[PDB]
Amino acid sequence: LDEDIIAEENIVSRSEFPESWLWNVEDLKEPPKNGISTKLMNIFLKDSITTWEILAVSMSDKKGICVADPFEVTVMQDFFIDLRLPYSVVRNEQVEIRAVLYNYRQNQELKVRVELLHNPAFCSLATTKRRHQQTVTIPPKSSLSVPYVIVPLKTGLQEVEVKAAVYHHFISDGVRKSLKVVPE
């Protein structure tokens, strides 16, 4: 807790991954200039690491409707985790989720201590007391896959969470995804 690394105490995961958002309504009441009202908008990007596509339509009784072109915005990171959960698991069947660790650093391998957090509602090598970590090496410009086998223990909506930190840097990610548990 004094090593060249970030602490699980201090990792705040990403969790907010909408599939669509900013379903908002703004009004060009600004002072027209050269005929073109201009609004500046303050938006907060959501946690997902992807490319957002923003679509605007304008309606004016003078000039009508107007499907603005699409406009792309890419949120990314040099290192992060992809927690690939499937749509739904069945309570009490054993599966294997994969944590994919991406390292898009130019030129140096990364050493990570990645860790599946304990969840009472799941049967994992992770206990209230003992944690479940490996320590792994990702080449640069590529991906390391990290198996975690688990067993869902309660129906309804359950939550898997992984955290990883790189050594010597102070980079860290953590994802909190949720999957449907269904009874047999």
Within positions 106 to 125, which residues make up the interface with other proteins, using CB under 8 A? 120, 122-125
Within 8 A by CB and 6+ apart from 64, the residues are none
Residue 66, CA distances (Å) to 22, 29, 61, 62, 171 in order: 18, 17, 11, 12, 43
Among 114, 117, 146, 160, which residue sits at the site for other proteins (rule: CB under 8 A)?
146
Query: At closest approach, how far in Å is the CB of 182 from other proteins?
Result: 11
- Is 167 within 8 Å of 3 (Cβ atoms)? yes
How far is 19 from 95, CA to CA, in rounded Å? 26
Whichever of 148 and 161 has its CB closer to other proteins, that residue is: 148
Gap between the Cα atoms of 81 and 45, Å rounded: 18
Taking CB under 8 A as the criterion, the residue among 90, 108, 140, 151 binding other proteins is 151
CB 89, min distance to other proteins, A: 12
Interface residue with other proteins, options 18, 108, 140, 182 (CB under 8 A)? 18
**Binds other proteins (CB under 8 A): choice among 90, 96, 110, 178:** 96
User: d(Cα 72, Cα 54) in Å, to the nearest integer?
Assistant: 6
Output the smallest distance, CB 162 to other proteins, in A: 13
Measured at the alpha carbon of residue 52, what is the angle toward residues 48 and 23, in degrees to the nearest 5? 100
Which is closer to other proteins, CB of 85 or CB of 159?
85
- Hey, which residues between 64 and 83 contact other proteins (CB under 8 A)? 64-69, 71-77, 80, 82
Give the closest residue to 173 by CA, choosing from 52, 82, 71, 105: 82
| Segment 26 to 65, residues that bind other proteins, using CB under 8 A | 26-30, 32, 35-65
